[PDB]
């Protein structure tokens, strides 16, 4: 694999701190992977076909229990994207880690890769893998009113097919927070 | 006991560039030091190094139409600091707010066919005024050129030397002459191996050299 | 490399369109192609000190954020009096957050937080604002002028005679 | 031999916050040094530590109506920095002259029945947005809670952690939304032992944390 | 705490000669250091040393009509700092922008006939007021004079001592008196050897002494 590529830094972090940190310690068992549906992708979509995913969806997890607890919190985020195919495909998709997402417009499309990112083509990668360290306005956050992050993908190359390949591909990804303090 | 009041004869303009400062008023106020926060940076340039870009062709499709047959000419674009080939371009906007600029320019290439497929391509510079675009790899080569293959690598980054008139140039271009400022610097290829449908990507970026002098608004604020 | 480290770019002024006998003070009040805010808008999170200049009349007067507006004219929280024609002040940061930003997606109106505040007088004409020691975080997308005609672009240039 | 009179272009406003000083005139006058005089202080905060306060309920009676029977709910108030529960309050007035404030908040409790009487009570915090006040000690506890008894002590001081949105907040409250800023943080109890008529007192005060930023008049001077 | 504002009573004129400076605005900008570039100089004087000049006679022909026969008188010119003999002259223009000047003055001579030809000539100074130009070498000599021949050298440089009234003088001349400021300092010769057609050249230049004080425009700007 291309291996991990970090967002802005690579380091073990502060984990234990002041009153709220003392009150909102690293509840490690709040952590667990799962899978989300992303989108479909056939020879149909021409370039520019955006598809966004706000974060984080509800989830029947201990994490998910607290994300309703409706309280000051902080979190981490670890992303691992892929889409199984076969070496006769061809193209290029773009995976994206967006801070403070806004509805884009045609012209700015051509700018995406400001953000941390990888490439998506059945040759080089088979496993995207990306992590954002926390941030936000407060030292902490309360979700429901806001979303500091989102996980978006959009076309970066038309998709090719021959007889040998599979005319449809599904795309998965891996979403689970880390480094949680509540 | 007055000190000689060597008064000022006509200076001290409230004007733009000035470095003069002011007086805190509801002042003397701390803030929690903002170190250790991520996403720090200083330089539009330097952040424009690790980040590549994209391009555009009249087909409005960022990637390159990459015909795969007996054709020899691939396609030809231009690289100004402001040109239809390079509008939607993290440099130009940052650029277009300037007049003087200097230093090398960067590019990229990303392949599309399955790795098995052999391939040949040839980047090539052309100086602004050869009076004729080349039409064969070896005679194209006479200006500047290089190679790679699908073999052993898929990415690549390329550069044109910062040729000019003087050791600087104008960002915007003129409406008083004809000759293109740079040329039509583009790519050739040797026999395509096999492909039902290729595709190419391409970028630009800051590197060791992309520099500027400065600055004024052009726009209609 | 001796520019595009904001420390030199964002220490100039910029006009602001609107005014009224009272008038909110914010960066996003700036024009979205004035060279000042472009870079600003070109980023996600930014902080600075702050300097402001106002050509005005009467009694310019200012309050920091998180305050009952209804109580400005009275009792004159800090200020100095009239003097024509230039007048130059600087405010230190006051907002309840360790950093500003540009846009805050929450279920697109700008939040009620990032607020250098407002000033009040009896007659207000001209406004000059200024950014100090600033820093920026997570740069954002950015555009240039759009391409319409054929060649590369065309534009007039000054020259003597 | 004039020194260059680098005159001032437009500064130096006779304005409010200023630190500039003046010239003594009928000056050069001593005073008997005022040390050793009692009652010295500096801090509104610090003097607001050793001094507790009181509260108020609609009965206009500062103490708490403390019913002593099978009831489970005691009474529920709020703690803003400005609220009917906490007007006549050595903090708020000092507070209401400010906008930014931070740090923990203090309370007190004073019992009334004869010491022999066993008792149970339960202070309990509630975060602003639980969407439902608790109605049982153990499920109330889920937010924050603690205990004491008549036994071995009669006084007590309590604190809520300075939860907020940001590490600061507005003193006055808004007329643009609904949700209470803090909640309805109040007290529960286990079976009353015996009493013909109880009574409770309660205060607030500065402590290690009560802080502010600053300042403007609100009033109609 | 004001410092005594010892204000200025009436000075500080925005005027010409001043040494006062200004404030960089779009400033703090380097340039590639311009050392090692050729053609450096500082002094109009010093560059007027290695460079000789020419002269003029009514024949508009720079060289000297050099008759070669029994004649004794060669020709007589004058050397002012501003005179028909010496207009088109790298000194005067540089000079004519000045009023005070001092120090010796330079000349040159370049021969024309074939080297074989023997020759004789005699430079000679005349002070302004001898009331009669000399008419014979030895009596000319009484003021100042010297010699050379074709033999062993062809070039030569000559000088008049900076005689004057005071240790300085006016560049332009007056319209209130008659006497020439310098004289008619010119050259004699002993028997010409043989020549079908000679020719002579002559210059002036700065040397160890050519100095000035200064300056004002005369012209009609």
DSSP per position, chain C: --SSBGGGTT-S--------SEEEE-STTS-SSSHHHHHHHT-SEEEEEEEEEEEE-S--EEE-SSS-GGGSTGGG-S-B---SS--EEEE----SSS---S------PPPS----EEEE-S-EEEEEEEEEEEEEES------PPP-SSSS---------
Q: Could C96 and D168 be called an inter-chain contact, meaning their C-beta atoms sit closer than 8 Å?
A: yes
Neighbours of chain D (3+ CB pairs under 8 A): A, B, C, E
Alpha-carbon gap, residue A17 to A27, rounded angstroms: 13
CATH architecture, domain defined by B1-221: Sandwich (2.60)
Phi/psi-derived region of residue D149, left when phi > 0, alpha when psi is between -120 and 50, beta in every other case: beta
Strand partners, B101: B169, B212
- Tell me, yes or no, if D146 comes closer than 8 A to chain A by beta carbon: no
- Give the three-class secondary structure for A32: coil
CA-derived radius of gyration, chain D: 25
Which residue, among C98, C114, C90, has the nearest Cα to C11 in the 3D structure?
Answer: C90
DSSP at A113: T
The bridge status of strand C88-91 relative to strand C124-137 is unpaired
- Residues with Cβ within 8 Å of A80's Cβ and at least 6 positions away in sequence, in order, are A127, A128, A129, A130, A173, A174
Q: Where are the domains of chain E?
A: 1-221
Q: Which two tokens stand for residue C46?
A: 């930014």
- Give the three-class secondary structure for E86: helix
Q: Could E30 and C2 be called an inter-chain contact, meaning their C-beta atoms sit closer than 8 Å?
A: yes
CA terminus-to-terminus distance, chain E: 53
Give DSSP secondary structure letters for B122-176: B-EE--TT-SS---SHHHHHTTEE--B-STT-S-B--EE----SBSBEESS--SS
Q: Could B88 and A121 be called an inter-chain contact, meaning their C-beta atoms sit closer than 8 Å?
A: no
Phi/psi-derived region of residue D117, left when phi > 0, alpha when psi is between -120 and 50, beta in every other case: beta
Alpha-carbon gap, residue C99 to D214, rounded angstroms: 19
DSSP at E50: H
Alpha-carbon gap, residue D52 to D90, rounded angstroms: 9
φ/ψ (deg, to 5) at B20: -70, 155
Alpha-carbon gap, residue A35 to A174, rounded angstroms: 6
Exposed (0-12), middle (13-18) or buried (19+): which is E18, by Cβ within 10 Å? exposed
Residue with the two structure tokens 């006679």: E57
Q: Could B63 and A92 be called an inter-chain contact, meaning their C-beta atoms sit closer than 8 Å?
A: yes
Give the rounded distance of the alpha carbon of E156 from its chain centre: 16
Q: Could B87 and C154 be called an inter-chain contact, meaning their C-beta atoms sit closer than 8 Å?
A: no
Nearest CA in chain B to D20: B23
Exposed (0-12), middle (13-18) or buried (19+): which is D200, by Cβ within 10 Å? middle
Exposed (0-12), middle (13-18) or buried (19+): which is D73, by Cβ within 10 Å? middle
* Residues E126-142: b if buried by 16+ CB within 10 A, e if exposed: beeeeeeebeebeebbe
Answer yes or no: are the C-beta atoms of D112 and D200 closer than 8 Å: yes
Alpha-carbon gap, residue B22 to D11, rounded angstroms: 8
Which residue, among B40, A18, B33, D176, has the nearest Cα to C93 in the 3D structure?
Answer: B33
Cβ count within 10 A of residue E152: 6
Q: Of all helices (H) and strands (E), which one includes residue A87?
A: none
Neighbours of chain B (3+ CB pairs under 8 A): A, C, D, E
- Tell me, yes or no, if D214 comes closer than 8 A to chain A by beta carbon: no
- Tell me, yes or no, if C45 comes closer than 8 A to chain A by beta carbon: yes
DSSP at C74: G
E27 contacts in chain C (CB < 8 Å) = none
* Residues C113-126: b if buried by 16+ CB within 10 A, e if exposed: bbbbbbbbbeebee
- Tell me, yes or no, if D2 comes closer than 8 A to chain E by beta carbon: yes
Which residue, among D167, D156, D57, has the nearest Cα to D103 in the 3D structure?
Answer: D167
Alpha-carbon gap, residue E6 to B3, rounded angstroms: 5
CA terminus-to-terminus distance, chain D: 53
Give DSSP secondary structure letters for B62-119: SSBP---SS----------SS-GGGSS-HHHHHHTT-SEEES-EE--BB--S-TTS--
Alpha-carbon gap, residue C36 to C15, rounded angstroms: 10
Distance of residue E18 Cα from the nearest chain C Cα, in angstroms:
28
Q: Could C74 and D15 be called an inter-chain contact, meaning their C-beta atoms sit closer than 8 Å?
A: no
Distance of residue C96 Cα from the nearest chain D Cα, in angstroms:
6
Residue with the two structure tokens 């000022």: B8
Answer yes or no: are the C-beta atoms of D22 and E1 closer than 8 Å: yes
Largest Cα span, chain B: 96
Answer yes or no: are the C-beta atoms of A38 and A53 closer than 8 Å: yes
The bridge status of strand C45-56 relative to strand C88-91 is antiparallel
Largest Cα span, chain D: 96
- Tell me, yes or no, if E33 comes closer than 8 A to chain B by beta carbon: no
Q: Could A20 and D127 be called an inter-chain contact, meaning their C-beta atoms sit closer than 8 Å?
A: no
Nearest CA in chain B to C44: B39
Q: Which two tokens stand for residue E80?
A: 């002012």
Give the rounded distance of the alpha carbon of A172 from its chain centre: 11
Alpha-carbon gap, residue B146 to B188, rounded angstroms: 10
C83 contacts in chain D (CB < 8 Å) = 12-14
How far is CA B72 from each of CA B69, B117, C106, D130, E105, rounded to the nearest angstrom?
8, 18, 53, 70, 77
Q: Could C80 and D100 be called an inter-chain contact, meaning their C-beta atoms sit closer than 8 Å?
A: no
Distance of residue E23 Cα from the nearest chain C Cα, in angstroms:
16
Neighbours of chain C (3+ CB pairs under 8 A): A, B, D, E
Alpha-carbon gap, residue E79 to E124, rounded angstroms: 13
- Residues with Cβ within 8 Å of E205's Cβ and at least 6 positions away in sequence, in order, are E48, E49, E50, E51, E52, E53, E90, E91, E106, E107, E108, E157
Report the residue count for chain D: 221
Q: Could D165 and A20 be called an inter-chain contact, meaning their C-beta atoms sit closer than 8 Å?
A: no
Exposed (0-12), middle (13-18) or buried (19+): which is D125, by Cβ within 10 Å? buried
Alpha-carbon gap, residue D128 to C7, rounded angstroms: 41
Which residue, among B75, B115, B76, has the nearest Cα to B195 in the 3D structure?
Answer: B115
C110 contacts in chain A (CB < 8 Å) = none
Which residue, among E131, E157, E154, E135, has the nearest Cα to E146 in the 3D structure?
Answer: E157
Q: Could D9 and B6 be called an inter-chain contact, meaning their C-beta atoms sit closer than 8 Å?
A: no
Q: What's the angle, vertex CA D20, arms to CA D15 and CA D21, rounded to 5?
A: 120
B3 contacts in chain D (CB < 8 Å) = 3
Answer yes or no: are the C-beta atoms of A168 and A77 closer than 8 Å: no
Pick from B93, B94, B197, B198 the residue to mutate for testing the A interface (most A CBs within 10 Å). Answer: B197
Residue with the two structure tokens 């701390």: B30
Q: Which two tokens stand for residue C103?
A: 């846009």
- Give the three-class secondary structure for D208: coil
Alpha-carbon gap, residue D211 to D49, rounded angstroms: 12
φ/ψ (deg, to 5) at C50: -155, 135
Answer yes or no: are the C-beta atoms of A63 and A180 closer than 8 Å: yes
Chains B and D touch each other (3 or more Cβ pairs < 8 A): yes
CA terminus-to-terminus distance, chain A: 34
Q: How many CB pairs under 8 A join A and B?
A: 75
Q: Could D219 and C71 be called an inter-chain contact, meaning their C-beta atoms sit closer than 8 Å?
A: yes
Alpha-carbon gap, residue E95 to A62, rounded angstroms: 96
Exposed (0-12), middle (13-18) or buried (19+): which is B111, by Cβ within 10 Å? buried
Answer yes or no: are the C-beta atoms of D117 and D194 closer than 8 Å: yes
Q: What's the angle, vertex CA A159, arms to CA A157 and CA A160, rounded to 5?
A: 130
């Amino acid at each position: 694999s291309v291996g991990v590529t970090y967002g802005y830094s690579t380091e073990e972090d502060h984990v234990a701190g002041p009153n709220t940190s003392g009150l909102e310690t690293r509840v490690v068992q709040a952590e667990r992977f799962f899978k989300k549906f992303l989108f479909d992708w056939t020879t149909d979509k021409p370039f520019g076909y955006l598809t966004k995913l706000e974060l984080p969806t509800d989830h029947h997890g201990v994490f998910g229990h607290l994300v309703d607890s409706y309280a000051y919190m902080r979190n981490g985020w670890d992303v691992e994207v892929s889409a199984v195919g076969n070496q006769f495909n061809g193209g290029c998709l773009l995976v994206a880690m967006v801070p403070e997402w806004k509805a884009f417009d045609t012209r700015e499309k051509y700018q995406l890769t400001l953000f941390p990112h990888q490439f998506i083509s059945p040759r080089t990668n088979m496993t995207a893998h990306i992590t954002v360290p926390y941030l936000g306005v407060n030292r902490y956050d309360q979700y429901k009113k806001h979303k500091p992050w989102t996980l978006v993908v959009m076309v970066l190359s038309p998709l090719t097919v021959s007889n040998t390949a599979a005319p449809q591909i599904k795309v998965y990804a891996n979403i689970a927070p880390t480094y949680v303090h509540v | 006991g007055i000190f000689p009041v060597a008064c000022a004869d006509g200076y001290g303009g409230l004007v733009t560039t000035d470095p003069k400062t002011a007086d805190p008023v509801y002042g003397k106020v701390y803030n929690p030091p903002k170190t250790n926060y991520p996403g720090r940076f200083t330089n539009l340039l330097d952040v424009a190094e690790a980040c590549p870009t994209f391009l555009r062709f009249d087909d409005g499709k960022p990637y390159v139409v990459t015909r795969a047959d007996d054709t020899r000419l691939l396609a030809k674009f231009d690289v100004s600091l402001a040109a239809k080939h390079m509008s939607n371009t993290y440099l130009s906007g940052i650029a277009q707010y300037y007049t003087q600029y200097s230093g090398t320019i960067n590019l990229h290439f990303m392949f599309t066919g399955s790795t098995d497929s052999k391939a040949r391509y040839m980047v090539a510079y052309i100086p602004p005024g050869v009076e004729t675009p080349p039409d064969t790899p070896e005679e194209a080569a006479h200006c500047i050129h290089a190679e790679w293959d699908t073999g052993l690598n898929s990415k690549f980054t390329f550069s044109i030397p910062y040729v000019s008139a003087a050791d600087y140039a104008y960002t915007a271009s003129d409406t008083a002459e004809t000759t293109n400022v740079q040329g039509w610097v583009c790519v050739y290829q040797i026999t395509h191996g096999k492909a039902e449908n290729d595709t190419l990507l391409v970028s630009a970026s800051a590197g060791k050299d992309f520099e500027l002098r400065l600055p004024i608004d052009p726009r209609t604020q | 490399r001796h520019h595009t480290d904001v420390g030199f770019i964002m220490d100039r002024f910029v006009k602001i369109n609107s005014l009224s006998p009272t008038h909110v003070i914010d960066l996003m009040q700036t024009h979205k192609h004035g060279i000042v805010g472009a870079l600003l808008r070109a980023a996600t999170y930014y902080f600075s000190d702050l300097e402001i200049v106002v050509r005005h009349d009467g009694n310019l007067t200012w309050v920091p954020n998180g305050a009952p507006e209804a109580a400005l004219s009275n009792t004159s929280n800090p200020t100095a009096y009239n003097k024509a024609p230039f007048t130059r002040l600087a405010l230190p940061y006051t907002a309840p957050h360790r950093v500003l930003a540009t846009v805050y997606d929450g279920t697109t109106q700008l939040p009620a937080s990032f607020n250098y505040g407002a000033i009040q007088a009896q007659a207000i004409h001209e406004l000059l604002v200024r950014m100090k020691r600033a820093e920026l975080y997570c740069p954002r997308p950015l555009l240039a002028i759009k391409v319409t005609s054929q060649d590369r672009y065309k534009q007039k240039i000054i020259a003597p005679a």
